[PDB]
Amino acid sequence: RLSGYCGSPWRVIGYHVVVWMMAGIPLLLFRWKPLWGVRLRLRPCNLAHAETLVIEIRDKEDSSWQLFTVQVQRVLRYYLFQGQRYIWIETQQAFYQVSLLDHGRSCDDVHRSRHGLSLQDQMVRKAIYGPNVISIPVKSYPQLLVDEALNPYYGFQAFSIALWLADHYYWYALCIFLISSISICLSLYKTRKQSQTLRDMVKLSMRVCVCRPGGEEEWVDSSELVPGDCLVLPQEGGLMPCDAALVAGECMVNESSLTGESIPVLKTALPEGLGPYCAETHRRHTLFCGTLILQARAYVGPHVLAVVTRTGFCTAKGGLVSSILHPPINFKFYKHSMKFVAALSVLALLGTIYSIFILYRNRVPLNEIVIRALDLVTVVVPPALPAAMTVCTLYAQSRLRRQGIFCIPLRINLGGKLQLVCFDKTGTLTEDGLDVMGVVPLKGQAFLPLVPEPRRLPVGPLLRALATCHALSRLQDTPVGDPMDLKMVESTGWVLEEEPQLQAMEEPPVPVSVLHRFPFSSALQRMSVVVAWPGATQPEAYVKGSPELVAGLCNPETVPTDFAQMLQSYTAAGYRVVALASKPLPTVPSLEAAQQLTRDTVEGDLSLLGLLVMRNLLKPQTTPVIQALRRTRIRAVMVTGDNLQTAVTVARGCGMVAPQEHLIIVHATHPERGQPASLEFEPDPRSRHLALSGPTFGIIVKHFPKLLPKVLVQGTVFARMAPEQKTELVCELQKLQYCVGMCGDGANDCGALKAADVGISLSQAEASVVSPFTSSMASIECVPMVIREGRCSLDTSFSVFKYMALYSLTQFISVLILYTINTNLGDLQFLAIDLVITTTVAVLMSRTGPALVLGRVRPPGALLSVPVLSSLLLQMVLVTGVQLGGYFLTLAQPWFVPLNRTVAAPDNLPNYENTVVFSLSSFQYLILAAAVSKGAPFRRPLYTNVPFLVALALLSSVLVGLVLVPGLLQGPLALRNITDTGFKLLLLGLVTLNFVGAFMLESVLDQCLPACLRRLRPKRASKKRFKQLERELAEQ
Ligand SMILES: Nc1ncnc2c1ncn2[C@@H]1O[C@H](COP(=O)(O)OP(=O)(O)OP(=O)(O)O)[C@@H](O)[C@H]1O
Ligand SMILES: [Mg+2]
């Protein structure tokens, strides 16, 4: 983020204190456009060298913040923003972030020496970088509650409680207070739980060994570590206190908590004096914070030495934690409710205008008129609204946890509107285990193949190349490492034995030892090893890489002419194949290369030896999930780095690419490299599917920008994709306004997961920080679960909107109808209606889960859609008609009359007006809940969640019992009894008529009649995504 800054000290003690002693009212006003509010009161102008209050000025940012400056100990002026420290430097006369001496301005020589820091005073290093800990703040209950109890909604609720108390409506005020307290408790619990769960991810404290200049040693706590300090890895122990660079020795770590992959990763000592150092160059020579150490070996001497380079939030996990906690925006925002709220507000305004008009006709005193008029606007805003909403997210998260998906959440609703998904091939769409079908000897005989053979008999460079070209290690009493290396070593039958210090057991010629090793990285598809055995003239070198890459990394004469056909035959069958190569590596070059640690020299003029053939089968759950996802018109795309033929075969097996397919290849020598197209198996078939290679996608995006947009739309199989290209592909797809989610397993695609709208990890076992979503089950069947849960949550939220609006308007209309005559509902009646009937039903409404199968129809877009408003208005017409009919029916019977213009106060409540209206409205409050809560395409039937049905039945039974002329609970509580037996036959008949009419109307509106009418004359809507979608019609 880019932004300038400015600051100045406080205004000198004087008029400002006294003026904003009174000017505290505009606090709510300044919540919008806060820059002027801080310019007043606090901020004068000052030079940019003695600032205390520090504020930002935009360069690309749109928000605003103010910061506090602190000095310690040169007084070291500094300030912290978003967890990043900034320190004033005299030479530059500007604030500088704490990254000096890092990011390529220090070389491997000074870094290499950099020993023991110094027996210096603690001020210089500790103060600048601070304590080494990722401090997630904690707050006390009084400190926490003030952050949400000051919202304008709760201020208005307090105003209402004050208003009702002045009117002697004691009971209703208590109900409002209880509901507000419940809402506050729910929000506080949510915030506390989220903060606590995030805090657990941060590691705990411990103490390590740290050396000092000379020969001294120390046993200090981890909190005292600072950059430049050298520490010794303890007893091959556990977690890494902080990021550090390995200067001496070799070890391996488990980076599942940071990269999401549980496969052990080898690390090697940092080369000396090569050049400037950086995280990218340090990837295979550094240890990241929060990563376990499995085994460490002392190359030479009694210690394995690492040098700390980053501490606190600056560490690798610190940035991920900051990005987890601080956020920026989904860009699928929901700012569409303002106009619906305005539409509701205009009705409220006209209703209160009518109330104040008619209320004057009753000659009510000049003071009682205004309070009773204000009561209308007071009741329009529905209490418990925040409570019904904070609980929906809790329900969704709890249900997701129950199924083994651990979401970090605002993306629950986002995941329900996915339209394109990316998948990896190995591990994700297929089995992790690998079966070896043998090797193809190529070490002679006119370069001709010797036919595959699953053997271990012959002795030669190929056998020991297989036996030693790996990075296996012994943990406890079993080997651990890459499954592919384990399977290869199993085929040979050689056993890993417990300068080189690693050797193979089986000794047909003689036992073999490994002098040097180069670990793998996803950027380059190869690994190297230096091997020596007794009696050898000089050590040899063996490498293992992708067949295509190594085929071009060896002597051109050695590789056979028909290598392409040989590689295509096995790959086209669905096998996963590799290649092996070896180098004579003469004596002096062999000795110097290992000493100098230069990798380029070893991976030079090699000689191809053979190919390993592996069998990798699809997971049984892969095909049904893909078929179900694709049936609902959701695009599925394969992003893989494997060979293109194998990826195409797997995609065909998975069910993808049913119709014709085509290939685009890099075969062109012209400087622009015009890309030809070939039919996998002439006109331009618009039903074609496109498959691209890594370099092909890398050059097309560069040289043919305008051909790219209609290639991504049709691309299905991406092969030989580099780890950085996956993120590029994900970002490019989003430029088409796509909503892309990705499911990845390996560590190479960690960056792609972050870029995607929703990222799901399959092999991970906890709610880590790498991806927003983590799946404990190693299968792709979780994506449909996420999609269905998201759409169900969205539908539940819309239903909550509708029910809350209906209840608010119903209460408003009932109160106004009472106002038309001369009477008001009793305070106890309001307490009942609000606290019990509305709240218990609203809170329990969101319990029902998602449907068992996905549907073609997508969830609703916005509230302003004609069907929602039309249904609301029709339901209100029905409700008001029912209420007015019930009211008018009473006049037929001999019923006396209320003492209008005699008392005209809420003390004559024992009358026939409030009784019937209350009885009819109480039933409607429950009837409306069922009508709108009903669901099918996205939610399970209403009778699925037992508690909601039980509560509805209990409330309906209680109300019906009340109606059926009891001698109790109906007289003392401001209700009037009637001897005529019109309850069962007529009043309940009208209630049932309302019930059936509302449900029939809701069914009619649910059916496609309202939507089909809107289809005329055109169909296009105002949503901008349709503008990009229509381009597919022109592109196909
Ligand atoms: N020992 C090895 N270490 C690393 N990569 C290897 C090794 N042997 C072969 N490879 C090659 O790595 C190439 C691609 O690297 P990458 O890590 O992207 O493969 P991958 O992880 O199998 O891809 P995917 O995740 O799609 O399966 C593959 O062609 C594979 O043959
Ligand atoms: Mg994988």
Residue numbers in the entry: 36 to 108, 161 to 414, 416 to 496, 498 to 587, 609 to 791, 815 to 1169
Paper text:
ATP13A2, which is mutated in juvenile-onset Parkinson’s disease and autosomal recessive spastic paraplegia 78, is a transporter with a critical role in balancing the polyamine concentration between the lysosome and the cytosol. The overall structure of hATP13A2 has a canonical P-type ATPase architecture, with the cytosolic A domain linking to TM1 and TM2 domains, and the N and P domains sitting on the TM4 and TM5. The P-type ATPases transport substrates by coupling ATP hydrolysis with protein phosphorylation states and adopting a series of intermediate states, consisting of E1, E1-ATP, E1P-ADP, E1P, E2P, E2-Pi, and E2, in a process known as the Post-Albers reaction. Here, we report seven cryo-EM structures of hATP13A2 in six intermediate states, importantly including the putative E2 and E1-like states, thereby providing a nearly complete atomic-level conformational cycle spanning the Post-Albers reaction process.
In the map obtained after incubation with AMP-PCP (an ATP analog), a blob of density was clearly visualized near the KGSPE motif in the N-domain, suggesting the conformation of hATP13A2 was successfully trapped in the E1-ATP state. The ATP analog tethers together the N, P, and A domains of hATP13A2 in the E1-ATP state. During the transition from the E1-like to E1-ATP state, the A domain, P-domain, and N-domain of hATP13A2 are tightly tethered together by ATP to form a catalytic center for ATP hydrolysis and aspartic acid phosphorylation. Distinct from the E2P map, the E1-ATP map has no corresponding SPM density near Site1. The further structural comparison suggests that Site1 in the E1-ATP state is covered by three hydrophobic residues—W251, Y256, and F963—which may sterically hinder the binding of polyamine substrates. The first conformational change within the TM regions involves Site1, which is closed in the E1-ATP state, open in the E2P state, and closed in the putative E2 state, indicating a gate function of the entrance site during substrate recruitment. Adjustment of the inward-opening cavity was induced by the separation of TM2 and TM4b, which formed angles of ~30° and 37° in the E1-ATP and E2-Pi states, respectively.
